[PDB]
mmCIF file of C-alpha atoms in Angstrom:
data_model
loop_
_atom_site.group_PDB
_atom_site.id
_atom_site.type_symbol
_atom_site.label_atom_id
_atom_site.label_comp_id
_atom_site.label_asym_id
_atom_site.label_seq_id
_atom_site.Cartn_x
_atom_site.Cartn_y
_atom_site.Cartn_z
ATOM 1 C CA UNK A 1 -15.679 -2.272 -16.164
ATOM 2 C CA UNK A 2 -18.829 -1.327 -14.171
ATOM 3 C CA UNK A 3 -18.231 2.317 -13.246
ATOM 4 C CA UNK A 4 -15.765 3.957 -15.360
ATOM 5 C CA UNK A 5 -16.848 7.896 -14.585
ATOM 6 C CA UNK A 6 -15.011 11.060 -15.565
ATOM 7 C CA UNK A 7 -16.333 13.951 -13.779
ATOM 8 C CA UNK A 8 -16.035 17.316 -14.092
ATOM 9 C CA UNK A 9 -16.135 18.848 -10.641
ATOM 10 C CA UNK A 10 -17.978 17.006 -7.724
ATOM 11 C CA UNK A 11 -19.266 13.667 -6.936
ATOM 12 C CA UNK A 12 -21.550 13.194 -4.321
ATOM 13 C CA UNK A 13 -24.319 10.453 -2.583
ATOM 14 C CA UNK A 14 -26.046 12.847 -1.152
ATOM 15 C CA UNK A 15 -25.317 17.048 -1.581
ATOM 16 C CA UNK A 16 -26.829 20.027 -0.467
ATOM 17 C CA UNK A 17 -25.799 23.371 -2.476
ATOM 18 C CA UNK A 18 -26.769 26.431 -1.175
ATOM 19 C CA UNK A 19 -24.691 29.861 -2.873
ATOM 20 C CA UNK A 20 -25.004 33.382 -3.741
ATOM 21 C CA UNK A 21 -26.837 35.376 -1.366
ATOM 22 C CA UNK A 22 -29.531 32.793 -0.215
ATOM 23 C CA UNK A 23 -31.756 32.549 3.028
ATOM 24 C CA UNK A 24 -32.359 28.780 4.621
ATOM 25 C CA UNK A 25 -34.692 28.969 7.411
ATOM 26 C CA UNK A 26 -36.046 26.282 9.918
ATOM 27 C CA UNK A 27 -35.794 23.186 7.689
ATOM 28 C CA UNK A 28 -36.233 20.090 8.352
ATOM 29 C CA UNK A 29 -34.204 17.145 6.540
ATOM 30 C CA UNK A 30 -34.490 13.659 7.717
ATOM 31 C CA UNK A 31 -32.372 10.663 5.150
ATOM 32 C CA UNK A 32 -32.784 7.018 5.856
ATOM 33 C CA UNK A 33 -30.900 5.221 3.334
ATOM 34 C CA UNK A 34 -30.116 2.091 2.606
ATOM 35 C CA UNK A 35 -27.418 1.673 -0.015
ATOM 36 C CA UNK A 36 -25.948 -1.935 -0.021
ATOM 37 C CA UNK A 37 -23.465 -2.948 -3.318
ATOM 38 C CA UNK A 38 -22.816 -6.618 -3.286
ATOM 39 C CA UNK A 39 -20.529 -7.128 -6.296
ATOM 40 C CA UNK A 40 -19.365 -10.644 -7.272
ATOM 41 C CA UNK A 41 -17.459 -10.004 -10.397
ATOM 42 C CA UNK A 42 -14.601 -11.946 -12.720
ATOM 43 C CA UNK A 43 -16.022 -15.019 -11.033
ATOM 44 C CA UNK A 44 -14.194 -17.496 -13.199
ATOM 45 C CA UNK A 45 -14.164 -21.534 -13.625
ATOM 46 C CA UNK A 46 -11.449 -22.244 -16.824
ATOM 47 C CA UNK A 47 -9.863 -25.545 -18.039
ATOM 48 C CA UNK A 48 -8.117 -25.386 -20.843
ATOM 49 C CA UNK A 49 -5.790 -28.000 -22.394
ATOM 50 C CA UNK A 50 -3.638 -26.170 -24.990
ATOM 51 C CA UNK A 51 -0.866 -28.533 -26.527
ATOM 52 C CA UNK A 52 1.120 -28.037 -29.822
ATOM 53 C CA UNK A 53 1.374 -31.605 -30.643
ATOM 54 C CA UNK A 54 -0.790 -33.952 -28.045
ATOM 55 C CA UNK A 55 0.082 -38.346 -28.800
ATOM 56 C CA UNK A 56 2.068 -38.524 -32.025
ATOM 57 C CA UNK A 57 3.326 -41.946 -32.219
ATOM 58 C CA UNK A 58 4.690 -44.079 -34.814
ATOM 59 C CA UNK A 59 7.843 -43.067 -37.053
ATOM 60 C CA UNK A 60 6.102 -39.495 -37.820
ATOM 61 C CA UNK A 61 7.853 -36.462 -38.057
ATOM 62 C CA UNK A 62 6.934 -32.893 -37.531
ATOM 63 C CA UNK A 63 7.877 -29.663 -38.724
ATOM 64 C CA UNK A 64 7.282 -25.850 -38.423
ATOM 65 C CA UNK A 65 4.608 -26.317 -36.070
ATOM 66 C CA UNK A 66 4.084 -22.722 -35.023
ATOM 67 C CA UNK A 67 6.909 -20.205 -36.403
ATOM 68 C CA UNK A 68 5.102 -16.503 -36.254
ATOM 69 C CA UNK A 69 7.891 -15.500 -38.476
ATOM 70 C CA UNK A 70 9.970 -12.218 -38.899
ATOM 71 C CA UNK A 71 8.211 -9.639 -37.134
ATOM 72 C CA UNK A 72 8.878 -5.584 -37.037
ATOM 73 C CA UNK A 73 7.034 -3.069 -34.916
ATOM 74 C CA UNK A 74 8.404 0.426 -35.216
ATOM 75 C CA UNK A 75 5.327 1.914 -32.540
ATOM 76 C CA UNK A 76 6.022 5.985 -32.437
ATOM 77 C CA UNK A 77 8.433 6.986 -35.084
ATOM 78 C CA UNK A 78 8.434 10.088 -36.196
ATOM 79 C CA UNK A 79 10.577 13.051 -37.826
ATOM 80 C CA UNK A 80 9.997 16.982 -37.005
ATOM 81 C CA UNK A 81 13.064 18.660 -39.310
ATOM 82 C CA UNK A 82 12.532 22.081 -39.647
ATOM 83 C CA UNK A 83 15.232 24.175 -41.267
ATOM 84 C CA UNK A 84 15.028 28.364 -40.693
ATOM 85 C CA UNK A 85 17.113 31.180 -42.046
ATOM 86 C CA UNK A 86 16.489 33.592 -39.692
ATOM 87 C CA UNK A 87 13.814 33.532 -36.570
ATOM 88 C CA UNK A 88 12.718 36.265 -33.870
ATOM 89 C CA UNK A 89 10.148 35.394 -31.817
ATOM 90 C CA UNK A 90 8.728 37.296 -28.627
ATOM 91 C CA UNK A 91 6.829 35.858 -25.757
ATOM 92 C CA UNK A 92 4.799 38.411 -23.240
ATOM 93 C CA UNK A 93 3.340 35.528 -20.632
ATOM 94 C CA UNK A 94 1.440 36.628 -18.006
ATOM 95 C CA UNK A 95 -0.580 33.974 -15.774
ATOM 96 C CA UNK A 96 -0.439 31.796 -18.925
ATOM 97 C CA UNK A 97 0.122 28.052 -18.909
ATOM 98 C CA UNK A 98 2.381 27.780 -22.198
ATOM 99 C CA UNK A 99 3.678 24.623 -23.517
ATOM 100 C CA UNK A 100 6.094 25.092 -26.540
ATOM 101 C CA UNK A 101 7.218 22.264 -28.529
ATOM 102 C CA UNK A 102 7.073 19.687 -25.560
ATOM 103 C CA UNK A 103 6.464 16.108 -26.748
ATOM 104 C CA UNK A 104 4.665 13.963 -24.109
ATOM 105 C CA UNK A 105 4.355 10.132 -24.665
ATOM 106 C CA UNK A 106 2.887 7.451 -23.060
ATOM 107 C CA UNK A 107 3.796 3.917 -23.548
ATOM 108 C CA UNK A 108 2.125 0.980 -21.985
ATOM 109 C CA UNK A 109 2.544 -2.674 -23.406
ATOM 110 C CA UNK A 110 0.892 -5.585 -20.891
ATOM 111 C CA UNK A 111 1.185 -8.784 -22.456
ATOM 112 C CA UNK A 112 3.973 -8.435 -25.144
ATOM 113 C CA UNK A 113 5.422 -11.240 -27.000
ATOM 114 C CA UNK A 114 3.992 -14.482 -25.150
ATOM 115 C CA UNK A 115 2.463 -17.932 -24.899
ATOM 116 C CA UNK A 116 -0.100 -19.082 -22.725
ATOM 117 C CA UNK A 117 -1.566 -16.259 -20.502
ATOM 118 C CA UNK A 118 -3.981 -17.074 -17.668
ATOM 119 C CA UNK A 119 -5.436 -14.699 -15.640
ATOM 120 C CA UNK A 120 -6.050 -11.310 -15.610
ATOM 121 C CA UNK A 121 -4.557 -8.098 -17.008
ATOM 122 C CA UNK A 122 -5.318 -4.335 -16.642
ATOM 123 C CA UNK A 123 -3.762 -1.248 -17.309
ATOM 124 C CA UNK A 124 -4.981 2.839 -16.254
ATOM 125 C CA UNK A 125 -3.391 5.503 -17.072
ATOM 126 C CA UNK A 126 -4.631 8.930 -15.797
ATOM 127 C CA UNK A 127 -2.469 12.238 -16.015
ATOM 128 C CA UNK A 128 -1.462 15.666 -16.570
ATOM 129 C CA UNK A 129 -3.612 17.936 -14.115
ATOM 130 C CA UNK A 130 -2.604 21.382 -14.655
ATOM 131 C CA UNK A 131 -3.629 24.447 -13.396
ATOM 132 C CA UNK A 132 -2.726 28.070 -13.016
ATOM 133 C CA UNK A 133 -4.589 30.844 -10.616
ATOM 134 C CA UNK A 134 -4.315 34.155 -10.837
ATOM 135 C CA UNK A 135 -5.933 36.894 -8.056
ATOM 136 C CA UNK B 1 -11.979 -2.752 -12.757
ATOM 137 C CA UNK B 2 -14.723 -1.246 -10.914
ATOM 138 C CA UNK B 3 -14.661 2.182 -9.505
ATOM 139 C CA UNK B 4 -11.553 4.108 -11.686
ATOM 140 C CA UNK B 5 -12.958 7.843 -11.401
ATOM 141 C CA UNK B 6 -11.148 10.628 -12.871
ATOM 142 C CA UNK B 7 -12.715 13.240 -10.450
ATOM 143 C CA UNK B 8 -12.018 17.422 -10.806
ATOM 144 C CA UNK B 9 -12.562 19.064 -7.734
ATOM 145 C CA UNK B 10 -13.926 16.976 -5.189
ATOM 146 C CA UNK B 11 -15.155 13.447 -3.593
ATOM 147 C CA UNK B 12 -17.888 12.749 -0.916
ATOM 148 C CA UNK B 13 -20.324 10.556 0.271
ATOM 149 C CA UNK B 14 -22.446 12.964 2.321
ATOM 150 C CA UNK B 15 -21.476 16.443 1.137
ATOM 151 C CA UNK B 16 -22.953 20.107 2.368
ATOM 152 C CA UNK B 17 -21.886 23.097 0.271
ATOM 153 C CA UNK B 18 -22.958 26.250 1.887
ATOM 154 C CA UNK B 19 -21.198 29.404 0.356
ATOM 155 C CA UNK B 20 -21.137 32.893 -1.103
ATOM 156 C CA UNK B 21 -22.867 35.738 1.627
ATOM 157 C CA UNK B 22 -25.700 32.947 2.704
ATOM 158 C CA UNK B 23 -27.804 32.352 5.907
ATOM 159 C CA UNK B 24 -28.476 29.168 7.069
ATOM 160 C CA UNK B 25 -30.951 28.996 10.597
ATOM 161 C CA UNK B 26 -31.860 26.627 12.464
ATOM 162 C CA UNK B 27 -32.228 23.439 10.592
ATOM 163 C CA UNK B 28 -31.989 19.552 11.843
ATOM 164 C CA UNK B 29 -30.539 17.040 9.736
ATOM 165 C CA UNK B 30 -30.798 13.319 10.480
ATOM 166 C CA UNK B 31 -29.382 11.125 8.535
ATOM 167 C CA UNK B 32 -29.744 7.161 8.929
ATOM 168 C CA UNK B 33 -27.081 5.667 6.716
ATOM 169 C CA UNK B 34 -26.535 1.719 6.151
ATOM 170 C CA UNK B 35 -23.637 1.910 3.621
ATOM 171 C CA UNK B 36 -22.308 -1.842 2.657
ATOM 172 C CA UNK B 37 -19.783 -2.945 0.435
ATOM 173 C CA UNK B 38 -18.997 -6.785 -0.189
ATOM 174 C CA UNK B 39 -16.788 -7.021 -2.525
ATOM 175 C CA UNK B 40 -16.109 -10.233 -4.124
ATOM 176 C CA UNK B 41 -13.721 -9.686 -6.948
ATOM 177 C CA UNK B 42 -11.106 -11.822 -9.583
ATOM 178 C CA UNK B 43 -12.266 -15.330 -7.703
ATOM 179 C CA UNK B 44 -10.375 -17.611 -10.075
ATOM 180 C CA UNK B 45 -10.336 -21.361 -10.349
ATOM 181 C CA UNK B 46 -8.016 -22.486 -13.028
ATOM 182 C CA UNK B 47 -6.998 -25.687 -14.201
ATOM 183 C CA UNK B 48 -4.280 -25.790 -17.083
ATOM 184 C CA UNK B 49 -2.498 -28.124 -18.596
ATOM 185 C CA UNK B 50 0.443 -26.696 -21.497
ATOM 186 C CA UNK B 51 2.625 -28.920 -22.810
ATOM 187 C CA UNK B 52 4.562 -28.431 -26.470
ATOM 188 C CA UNK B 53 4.740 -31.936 -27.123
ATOM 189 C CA UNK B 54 2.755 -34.417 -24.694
ATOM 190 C CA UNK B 55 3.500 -38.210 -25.405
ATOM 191 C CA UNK B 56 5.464 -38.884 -28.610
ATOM 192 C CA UNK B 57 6.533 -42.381 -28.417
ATOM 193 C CA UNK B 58 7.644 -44.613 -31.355
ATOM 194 C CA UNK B 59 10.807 -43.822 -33.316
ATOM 195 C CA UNK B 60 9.503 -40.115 -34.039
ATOM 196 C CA UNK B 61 10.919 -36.980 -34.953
ATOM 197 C CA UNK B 62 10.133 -33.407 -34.262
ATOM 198 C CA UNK B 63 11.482 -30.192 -35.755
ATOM 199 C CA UNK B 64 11.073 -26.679 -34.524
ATOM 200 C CA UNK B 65 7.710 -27.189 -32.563
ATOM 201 C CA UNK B 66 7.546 -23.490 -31.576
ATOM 202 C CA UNK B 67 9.863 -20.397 -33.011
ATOM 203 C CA UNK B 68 9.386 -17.279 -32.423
ATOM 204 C CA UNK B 69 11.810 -16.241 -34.793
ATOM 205 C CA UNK B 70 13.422 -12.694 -35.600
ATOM 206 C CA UNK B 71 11.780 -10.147 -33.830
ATOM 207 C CA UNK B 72 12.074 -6.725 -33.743
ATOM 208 C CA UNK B 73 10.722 -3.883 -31.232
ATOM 209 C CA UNK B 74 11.865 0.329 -31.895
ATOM 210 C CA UNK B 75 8.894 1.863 -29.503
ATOM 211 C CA UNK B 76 10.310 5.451 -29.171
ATOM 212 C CA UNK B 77 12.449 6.825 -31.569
ATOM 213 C CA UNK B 78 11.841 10.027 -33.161
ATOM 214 C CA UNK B 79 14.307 12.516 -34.401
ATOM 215 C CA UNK B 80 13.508 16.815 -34.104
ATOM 216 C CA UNK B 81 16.550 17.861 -36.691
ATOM 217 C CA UNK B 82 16.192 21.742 -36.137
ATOM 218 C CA UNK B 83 18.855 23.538 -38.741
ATOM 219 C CA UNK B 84 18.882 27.503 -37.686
ATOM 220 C CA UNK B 85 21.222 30.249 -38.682
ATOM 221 C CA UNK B 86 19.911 32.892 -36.729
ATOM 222 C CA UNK B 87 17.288 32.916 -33.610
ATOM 223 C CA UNK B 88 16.778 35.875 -31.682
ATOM 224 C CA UNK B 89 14.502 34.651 -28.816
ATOM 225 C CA UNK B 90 12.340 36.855 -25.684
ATOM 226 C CA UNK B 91 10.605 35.506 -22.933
ATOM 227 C CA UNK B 92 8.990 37.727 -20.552
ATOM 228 C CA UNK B 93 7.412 35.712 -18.217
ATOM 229 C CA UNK B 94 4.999 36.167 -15.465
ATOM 230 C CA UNK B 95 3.230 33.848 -12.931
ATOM 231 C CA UNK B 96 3.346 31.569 -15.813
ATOM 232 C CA UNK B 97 4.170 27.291 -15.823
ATOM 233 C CA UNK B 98 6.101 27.503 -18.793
ATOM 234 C CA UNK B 99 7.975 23.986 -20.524
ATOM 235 C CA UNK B 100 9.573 24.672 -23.715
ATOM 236 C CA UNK B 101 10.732 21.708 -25.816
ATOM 237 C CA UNK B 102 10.869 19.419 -22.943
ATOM 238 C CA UNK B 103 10.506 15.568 -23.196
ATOM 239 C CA UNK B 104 8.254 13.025 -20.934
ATOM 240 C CA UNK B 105 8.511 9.431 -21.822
ATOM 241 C CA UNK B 106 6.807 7.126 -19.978
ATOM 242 C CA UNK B 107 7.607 3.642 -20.790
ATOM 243 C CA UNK B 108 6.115 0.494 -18.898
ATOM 244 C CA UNK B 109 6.542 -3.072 -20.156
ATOM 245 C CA UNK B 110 4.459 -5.651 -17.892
ATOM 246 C CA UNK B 111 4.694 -9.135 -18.747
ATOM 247 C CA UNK B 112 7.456 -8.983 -21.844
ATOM 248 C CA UNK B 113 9.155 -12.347 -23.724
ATOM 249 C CA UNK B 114 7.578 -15.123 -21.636
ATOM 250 C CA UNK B 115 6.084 -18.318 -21.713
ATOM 251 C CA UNK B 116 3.520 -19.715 -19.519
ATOM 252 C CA UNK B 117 2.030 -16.559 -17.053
ATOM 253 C CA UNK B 118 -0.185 -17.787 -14.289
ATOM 254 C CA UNK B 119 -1.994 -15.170 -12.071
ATOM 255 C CA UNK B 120 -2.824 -11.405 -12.144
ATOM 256 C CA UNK B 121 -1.029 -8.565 -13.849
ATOM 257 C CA UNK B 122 -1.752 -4.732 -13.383
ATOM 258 C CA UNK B 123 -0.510 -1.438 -14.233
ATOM 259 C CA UNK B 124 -1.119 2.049 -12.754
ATOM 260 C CA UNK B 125 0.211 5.689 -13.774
ATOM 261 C CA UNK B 126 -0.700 8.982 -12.686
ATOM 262 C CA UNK B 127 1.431 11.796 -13.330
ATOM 263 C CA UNK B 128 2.190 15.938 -13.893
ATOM 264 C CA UNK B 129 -0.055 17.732 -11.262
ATOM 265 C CA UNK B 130 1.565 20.945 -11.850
ATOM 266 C CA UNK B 131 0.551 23.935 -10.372
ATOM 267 C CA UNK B 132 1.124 27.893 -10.276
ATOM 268 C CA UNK B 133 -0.935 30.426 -7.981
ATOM 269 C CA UNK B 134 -0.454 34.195 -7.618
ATOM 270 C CA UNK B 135 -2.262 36.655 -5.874
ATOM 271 C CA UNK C 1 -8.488 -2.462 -9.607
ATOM 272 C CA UNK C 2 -11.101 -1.716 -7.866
ATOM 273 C CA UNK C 3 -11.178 2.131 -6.699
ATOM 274 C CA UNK C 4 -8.112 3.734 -8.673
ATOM 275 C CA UNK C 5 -9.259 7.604 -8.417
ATOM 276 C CA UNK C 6 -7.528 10.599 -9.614
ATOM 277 C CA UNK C 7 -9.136 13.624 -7.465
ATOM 278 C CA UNK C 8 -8.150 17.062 -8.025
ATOM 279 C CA UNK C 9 -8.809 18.831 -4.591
ATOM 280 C CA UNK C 10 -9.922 17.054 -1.504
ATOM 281 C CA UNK C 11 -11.299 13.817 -0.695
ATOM 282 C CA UNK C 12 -14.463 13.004 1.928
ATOM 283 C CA UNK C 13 -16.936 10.688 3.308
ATOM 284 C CA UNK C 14 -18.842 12.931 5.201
ATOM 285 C CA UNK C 15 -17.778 16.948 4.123
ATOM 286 C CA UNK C 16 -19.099 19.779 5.484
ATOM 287 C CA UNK C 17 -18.031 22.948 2.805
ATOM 288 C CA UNK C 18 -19.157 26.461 4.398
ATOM 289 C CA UNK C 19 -17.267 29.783 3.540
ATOM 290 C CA UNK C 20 -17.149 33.377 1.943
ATOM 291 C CA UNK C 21 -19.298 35.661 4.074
ATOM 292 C CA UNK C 22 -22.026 33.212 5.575
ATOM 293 C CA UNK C 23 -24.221 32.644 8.400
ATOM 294 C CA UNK C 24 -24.703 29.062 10.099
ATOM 295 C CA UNK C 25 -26.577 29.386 13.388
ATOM 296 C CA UNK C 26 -27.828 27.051 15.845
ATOM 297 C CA UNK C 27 -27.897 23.761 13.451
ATOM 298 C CA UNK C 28 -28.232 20.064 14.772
ATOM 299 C CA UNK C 29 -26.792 17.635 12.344
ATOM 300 C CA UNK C 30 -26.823 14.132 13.651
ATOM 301 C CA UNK C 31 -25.349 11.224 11.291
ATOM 302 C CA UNK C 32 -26.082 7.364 11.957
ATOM 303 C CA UNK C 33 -23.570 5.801 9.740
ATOM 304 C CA UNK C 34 -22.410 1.875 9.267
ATOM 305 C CA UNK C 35 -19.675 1.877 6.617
ATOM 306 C CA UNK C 36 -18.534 -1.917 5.669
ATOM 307 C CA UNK C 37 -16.429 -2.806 3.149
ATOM 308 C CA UNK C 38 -15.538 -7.028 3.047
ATOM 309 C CA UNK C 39 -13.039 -7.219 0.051
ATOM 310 C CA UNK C 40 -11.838 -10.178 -1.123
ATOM 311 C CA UNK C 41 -9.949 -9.993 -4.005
ATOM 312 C CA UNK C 42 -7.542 -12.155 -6.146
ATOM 313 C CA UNK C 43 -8.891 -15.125 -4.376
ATOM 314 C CA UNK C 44 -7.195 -17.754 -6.864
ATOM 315 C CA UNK C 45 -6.910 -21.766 -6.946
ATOM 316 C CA UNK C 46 -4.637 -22.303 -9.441
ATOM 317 C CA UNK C 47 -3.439 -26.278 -11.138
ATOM 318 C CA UNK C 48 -1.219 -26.184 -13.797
ATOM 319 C CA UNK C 49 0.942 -28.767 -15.006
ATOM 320 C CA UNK C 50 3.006 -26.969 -18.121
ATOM 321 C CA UNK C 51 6.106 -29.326 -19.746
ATOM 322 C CA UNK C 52 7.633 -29.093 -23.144
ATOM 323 C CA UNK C 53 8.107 -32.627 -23.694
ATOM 324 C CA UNK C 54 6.176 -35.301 -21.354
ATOM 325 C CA UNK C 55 6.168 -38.633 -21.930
ATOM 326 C CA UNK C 56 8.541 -38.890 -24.735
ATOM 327 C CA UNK C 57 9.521 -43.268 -25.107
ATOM 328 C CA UNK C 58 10.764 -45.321 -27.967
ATOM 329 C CA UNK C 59 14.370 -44.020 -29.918
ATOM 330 C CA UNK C 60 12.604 -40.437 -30.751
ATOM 331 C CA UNK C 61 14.461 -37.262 -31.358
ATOM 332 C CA UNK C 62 13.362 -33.703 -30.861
ATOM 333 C CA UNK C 63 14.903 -31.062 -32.276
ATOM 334 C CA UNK C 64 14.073 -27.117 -31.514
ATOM 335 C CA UNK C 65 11.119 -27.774 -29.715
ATOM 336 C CA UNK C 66 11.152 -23.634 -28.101
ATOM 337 C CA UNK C 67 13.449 -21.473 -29.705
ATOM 338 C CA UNK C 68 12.560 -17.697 -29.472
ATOM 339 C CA UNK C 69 15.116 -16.603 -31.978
ATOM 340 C CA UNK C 70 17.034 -13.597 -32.323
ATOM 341 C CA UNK C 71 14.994 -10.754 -30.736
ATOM 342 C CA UNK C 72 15.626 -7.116 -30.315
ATOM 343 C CA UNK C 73 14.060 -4.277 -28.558
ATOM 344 C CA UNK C 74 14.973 -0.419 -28.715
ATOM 345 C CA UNK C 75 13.210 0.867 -26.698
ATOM 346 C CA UNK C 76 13.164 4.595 -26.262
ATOM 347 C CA UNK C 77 15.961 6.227 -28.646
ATOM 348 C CA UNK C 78 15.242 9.461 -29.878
ATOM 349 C CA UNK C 79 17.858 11.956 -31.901
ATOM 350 C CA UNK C 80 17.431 15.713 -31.363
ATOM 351 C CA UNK C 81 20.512 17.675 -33.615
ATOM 352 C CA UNK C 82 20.394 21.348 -33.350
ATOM 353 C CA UNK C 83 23.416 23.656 -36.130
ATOM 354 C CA UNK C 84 23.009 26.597 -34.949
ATOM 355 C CA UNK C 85 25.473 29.946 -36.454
ATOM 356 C CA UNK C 86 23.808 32.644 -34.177
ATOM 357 C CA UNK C 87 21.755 32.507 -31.172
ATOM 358 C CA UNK C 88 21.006 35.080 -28.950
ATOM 359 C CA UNK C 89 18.047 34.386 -26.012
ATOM 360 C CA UNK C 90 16.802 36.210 -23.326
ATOM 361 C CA UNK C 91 14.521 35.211 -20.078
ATOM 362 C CA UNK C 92 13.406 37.745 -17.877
ATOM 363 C CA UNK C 93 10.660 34.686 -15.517
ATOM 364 C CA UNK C 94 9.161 36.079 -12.455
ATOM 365 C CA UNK C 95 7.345 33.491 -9.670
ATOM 366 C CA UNK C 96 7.030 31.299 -12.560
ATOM 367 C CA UNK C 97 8.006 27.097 -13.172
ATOM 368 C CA UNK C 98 10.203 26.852 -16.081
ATOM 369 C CA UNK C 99 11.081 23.609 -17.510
ATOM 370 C CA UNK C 100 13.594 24.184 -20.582
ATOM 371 C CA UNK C 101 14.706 21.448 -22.498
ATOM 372 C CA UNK C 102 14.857 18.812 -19.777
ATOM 373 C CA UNK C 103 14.381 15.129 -20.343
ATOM 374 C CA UNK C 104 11.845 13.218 -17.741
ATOM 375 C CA UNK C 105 12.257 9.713 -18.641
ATOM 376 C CA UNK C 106 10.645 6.604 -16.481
ATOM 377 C CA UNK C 107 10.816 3.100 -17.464
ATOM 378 C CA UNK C 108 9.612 -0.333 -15.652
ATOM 379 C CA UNK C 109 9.629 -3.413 -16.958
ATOM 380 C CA UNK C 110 7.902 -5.704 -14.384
ATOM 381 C CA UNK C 111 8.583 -9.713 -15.938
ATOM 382 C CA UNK C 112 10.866 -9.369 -18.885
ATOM 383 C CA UNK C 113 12.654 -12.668 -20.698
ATOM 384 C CA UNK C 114 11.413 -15.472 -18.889
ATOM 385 C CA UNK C 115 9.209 -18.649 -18.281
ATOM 386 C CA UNK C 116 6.675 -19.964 -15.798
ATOM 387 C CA UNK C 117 5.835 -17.177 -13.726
ATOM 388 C CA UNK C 118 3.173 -17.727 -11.006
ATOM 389 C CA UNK C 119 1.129 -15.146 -8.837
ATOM 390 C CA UNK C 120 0.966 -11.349 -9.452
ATOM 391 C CA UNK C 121 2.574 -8.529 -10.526
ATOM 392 C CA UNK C 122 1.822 -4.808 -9.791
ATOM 393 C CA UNK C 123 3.668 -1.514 -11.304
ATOM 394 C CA UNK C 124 2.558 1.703 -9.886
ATOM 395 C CA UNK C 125 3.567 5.187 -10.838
ATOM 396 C CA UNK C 126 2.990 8.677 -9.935
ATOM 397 C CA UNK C 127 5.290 11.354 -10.044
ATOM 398 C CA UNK C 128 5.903 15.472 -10.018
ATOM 399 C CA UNK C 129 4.154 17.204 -7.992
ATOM 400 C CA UNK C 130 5.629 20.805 -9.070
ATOM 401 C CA UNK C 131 4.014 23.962 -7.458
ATOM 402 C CA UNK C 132 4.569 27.833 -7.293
ATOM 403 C CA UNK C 133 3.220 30.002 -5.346
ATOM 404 C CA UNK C 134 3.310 33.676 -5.075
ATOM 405 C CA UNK C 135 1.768 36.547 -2.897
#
């Protein structure tokens, strides 16, 4: 919530980058930094009275106070039919990265069907580095 | 919460890159770091009170305070019919990472059907570095 | 949730990168580093008091006061037919990774049907770390 970075190759305080065919004579670097991070973060202070039904009294009488009625989810549902005669296929690969057909899914629920959370809740999700490397 | 980096090649505080048919001579860093960190994170002071019916007195009645009534969850369910009468398939493959008609499911369910969660809840997932290197 | 990093490579306070046909003569690096890092996390003071009927005097009734009713969950269910008359296939794979039809599934449910929890909860996952490697 306060750095959320996605970088591409290199992250760095402080970098020197010095490449293709270069000459780096007699220098003379001289840092004095200072880098303090003093986070305070989330600091929280709650109170919370939640009640359904808080000092009924005399000869009352209640009734569906909270029904979350019927309730469907159907989250990743779905049909690939494919209906072929006759199919040749021909695959020459060479230092390829092939995927064919593959289904990757990814399912993260925190705080499903509930009452009265307190807290905190977080959820990262952070995949699939491929790679091929050919001479 | 605070620092979630998805990062490509590489990480560093301090970081010299010196590459690629280069000549580097007498130099003199000096560096003077003061690097602090005081972290001071998810301090929580709660104070809750829950109750569903608090202090019914006098010759009351109640009737379904709270229903969660029919419920239904189908997350993942998808069907790949695949009706052929003839395939003729040919792979040649070379230094390749092939998957063909594979299946990752990834399924993570924190706090499900509850009542009444106090705390801290957290969920990570990192997955697939795949890899292929030829000369 | 604080520092959750994916890195692709390598990983570094202070790196030092030099390679490929270079020259590094007669250098004087000299680092002065103070690296602190005071966490303290989750620090939590918690009071809760959570009853589903307190206090209740005086010839009352209740009736249903929490009913979570008929509940389902289906969670991954997937249906992959395949009619085939004829097939005829042929791999010829050299240093390669093949993954053919397989099925990677991973599932966690941390707190499923239940009431009152306290405290904290954590689900981590990482997983294959496939490689090939040829001359």
């Amino acid at each position: 919530s306060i750095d959320v970075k996605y970088i591409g190759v290199k992250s760095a305080y402080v970098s020197y980058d010095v490449q293709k065919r270069t000459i780096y004579l007699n220098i003379t670097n001289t840092l004095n930094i200072t880098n303090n991070n003093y986070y305070s973060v989330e600091v929280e202070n709650i109170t919370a009275q939640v009640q359904f039904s808080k000092t009924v009294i005399g000869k009352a009488r209640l009734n569906n106070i909270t029904i979350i009625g019927p309730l469907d989810m159907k989250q990743i549902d779905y049909t690939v039919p494919t209906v072929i005669a006759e199919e040749m296929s021909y695959m020459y690969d060479f230092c390829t990265l092939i995927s064919i057909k593959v289904h990757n899914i990814v399912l993260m629920m925190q705080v499903t069907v509930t009452t009265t959370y307190f807290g905190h809740s977080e959820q990262i999700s952070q995949e699939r580095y491929q790679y091929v490397d050919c001479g």
